């Protein structure tokens, strides 16, 4: 009919959603978590240091074996690091040096990488010739790639600079399901432990829960006040944390559909580059735009520790699947392991 | 000690040597970022010297290998990926002078130049200002006054004066004078003069960077 009716319809729908949220929200997480013993101070030491990269490291991911990890730097090299011996397993010369995201397949057969070059690249590691080669080259995206994660050897999700997300079939190289609900640049993705749901954060300060099979957005969050730079699912898949450039970190629960608690501090004025949960979910590690990475109590929201071992902006942060150690990358080209 | 990991050590050493060689090779080359309002002014410059989201162009001039990156096809928020070029040697800002008569575009170009030259990431990287379409600009001068978009302008409608006025207006946007230097050049469909000016600017930028690293400049 006319825009005047659709706008007011959307407004009243949003008002009803807010009223339902307020009615369901009976108590805050602080009052209920007060009965939990605080974790106290958690001191961590750099057990390993990796100095193979010669440029700013932007993205990395841990392998399912909790020993191997892939590191993506803008020097045009993907280095598979043996965390135990710090040995370089493979060095992949990238066709485009301007990469800012990479993923390690769960089985370890393939690894993905992308960035300013909208065309992704799937590299097969276990080739019979012994040399890494691109198995597939996804080129359907129009914006810079920001985050990608493997659902399987034949399925991979990928976010881009545009306000869209896609699920690609590596066998044929076609988008199986395209998500377009977002209104801002999708910067980070995180797959749920069940491989059924995944949440995406964008620059519109909102988080949307998308299904890998259905493709319809279930829940939408708008509790942040700036661009969401990082996102990570709770180890049980029932909640997730969101890092934004306004130094605010908000933990959102799927069942509650609202931020349970916010992690912030006066001295902490810079944004958050990466966020990662521990195996128990009690510790929330977040890498900030500064040279420090802080450990936050996922329930009490207290600074359990600070990994101030870097000298440049912390770019990536990932905890091992076994929870034994956490790798923190920085723009200083170094990658350190903490535990 | 180890039995088989001892060979993995040699493999990692070879990989590290290859990484060092590749890094040295990359450092031997010079990186340039191509920006500006309008695709024509950038396309002509990309064409005048040469051997998706982002395009990488190569060209060698007087033993120097230049790497020019065009990011006009991104069409995404720059503040989320502009930091990727924090290490480029110089920025090539291409703008057509004829924009002053086409719909106001001069104001957008000036805004983009001010946003770029005053960005925290590019605080140290100089910018090469390419004022393209000098011939068309000269032609437009005799037709419409320059005050259409510059109300404060007061002078004769001659090519040289208007060109100098626009150059001054553009360079004045830099708020880091003591740190930046703008190499302005008027160009059109031309011979190697353009790549020659690019080479001359890159050489001076490299000399000044070395002097700053040594504490002289």
């Amino acid at each position, epitope marked *: 009919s006319e825009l005047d009716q659709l706008r007011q319809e959307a407004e009243q729908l949003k008002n009803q959603i807010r009223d339902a949220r307020k009615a369901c929200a009976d108590a805050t997480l602080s009052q209920i978590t007060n009965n939990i013993d605080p974790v106290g101070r958690i001191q961590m030491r750099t057990r390993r240091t990796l100095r193979g990269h010669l440029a700013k490291i932007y993205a990395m991911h841990w392998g399912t074996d909790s020993r191997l990890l892939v590191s993506a730097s803008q020097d045009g090299k993907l280095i598979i690091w043996d965390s135990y011996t710090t040995n370089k397993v493979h060095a992949i010369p990238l066709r485009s040096s301007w990469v800012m995201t990479c993923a390690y397949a769960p089985s370890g057969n393939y690894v993905a990488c992308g960035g300013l070059d909208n065309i992704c690249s799937i590299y097969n590691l276990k080739t019979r010739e012994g040399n890494v080669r691109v198995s597939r080259e996804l080129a359907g995206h129009t914006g810079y790639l920001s985050c990608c994660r493997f659902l399987d050897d034949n399925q991979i999700v990928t976010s881009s600079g545009d306000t869209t997300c896609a699920l690609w079939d590596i066998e044929t190289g076609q988008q199986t399901t395209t998500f377009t609900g977002h209104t801002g640049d999708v910067m980070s993705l995180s797959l749920a432990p069940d491989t059924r749901l995944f949440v995406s954060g964008a620059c519109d300060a909102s988080a949307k829960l998308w299904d890998v099979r259905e493709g319809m957005c279930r829940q939408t969050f708008t509790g942040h006040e700036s661009d969401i730079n990082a996102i990570c699912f709770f180890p049980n898949g029932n909640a997730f944390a969101t890092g934004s450039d306004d130094a605010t970190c908000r933990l959102f629960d799927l069942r509650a559909d609202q931020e349970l608690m916010t992690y912030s501090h006066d001295n902490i004025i810079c944004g958050i580059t990466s966020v990662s949960f521990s195996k128990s979910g009690r510790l929330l590690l977040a890498g900030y735009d500064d040279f420090n990475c802080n450990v936050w109590d996922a329930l009490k929201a207290d600074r359990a520790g600070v990994l101030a071992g870097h000298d440049n902006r912390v770019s990536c942060l990932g905890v091992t699947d076994d929870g034994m150690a956490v790798a923190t990358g920085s723009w200083d080209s170094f990658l350190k392991i903490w535990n | 000690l180890s*039995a088989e990991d001892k060979a993995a050590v040699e493999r990692s050493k070879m990989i590290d040597r290859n990484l060092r060689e590749d890094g040295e090779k990359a450092a031997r080359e010079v990186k340039l970022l191509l920006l500006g309002a309008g695709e024509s002014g950038k396309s002509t410059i990309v064409k005048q010297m040469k051997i998706t989201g982002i395009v990488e162009t190569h060209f060698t001039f007087k033993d120097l290998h230049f790497k020019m990156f065009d990011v006009g096809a991104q069409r995404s928020e720059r503040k989320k990926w502009i930091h990727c070029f924090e290490g480029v040697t110089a920025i090539i800002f291409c703008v057509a002078l004829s924009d002053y008569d086409l719909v106001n575009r001069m104001h957008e170009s000036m805004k983009l130049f001010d946003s770029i030259c005053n960005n925290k990431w590019f605080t140290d990287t100089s910018i090469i200002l390419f004022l393209n379409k000098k011939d068309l600009f000269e032609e437009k001068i005799k037709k419409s006054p320059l005050t259409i978009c510059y109300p404060e302008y007061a002078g004769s409608n001659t090519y040289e004066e208007a060109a100098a006025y626009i150059q001054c207006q553009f360079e004045d946007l830099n708020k880091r004078k003591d740190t930046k230097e703008i190499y302005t050049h008027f160009t059109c469909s031309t011979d190697t003069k353009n790549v020659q000016f690019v080479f001359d600017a890159v050489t001076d930028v490299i000399i000044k960077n070395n002097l700053k690293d040594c504490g002289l400049f």
Partner: single-chain antibody
Amino acid sequence: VQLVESGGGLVQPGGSRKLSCSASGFAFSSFGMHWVRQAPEKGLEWVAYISSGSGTIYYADTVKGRFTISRDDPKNTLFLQMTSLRSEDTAMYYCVRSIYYYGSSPFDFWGQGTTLTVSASADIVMTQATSSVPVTPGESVSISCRSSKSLLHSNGNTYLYWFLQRPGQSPQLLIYRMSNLASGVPDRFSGSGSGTAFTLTISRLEAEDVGVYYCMQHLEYPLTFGAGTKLEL
């Protein structure tokens, strides 16, 4: 992946000959090369090894100083120069590639080899419990071997290797490190061990299983193969 050895034929005692082998279908510069010879009746024996970077060249005590191993990466060819070879050196020489990294499968490919005939301690001994064992289709066979010392390195990896040489073909890697099967090998094979006593089971034995099963340890560079277990159909 293909390896074609060359430089065989008859040679007089005390002479010299240079064995060569052209490599194709893989990154020769990335793989390390090994030389394994098989006497007309004896089992396999390690001869020489050269790393991917032409460094850390090692020779067995039986051939140290007498033979020479060299590789030409720009030419993609391997060369084994034999100087004043003895009569005991008569054996068919097989070329073997290797790549060493976490999760790698070295000795995964063996060349066809060429016949070379000369005209008329301090190593891990693999004491094979048996030389021949009768088997039938559909049944199961257990091949076992013993080593001088526990191959279980401090890192928990058991440097044990099991090869199978079918009649009329070069040996092929079945299981490496006692816990991982090579690519292209049926999953019905099962090898295990406690570090000193090892057992190799073959469930659902087929006609393709006939051959000689050679065991090898990689705890120390002086590799010493076993006597080989020949199965009768």
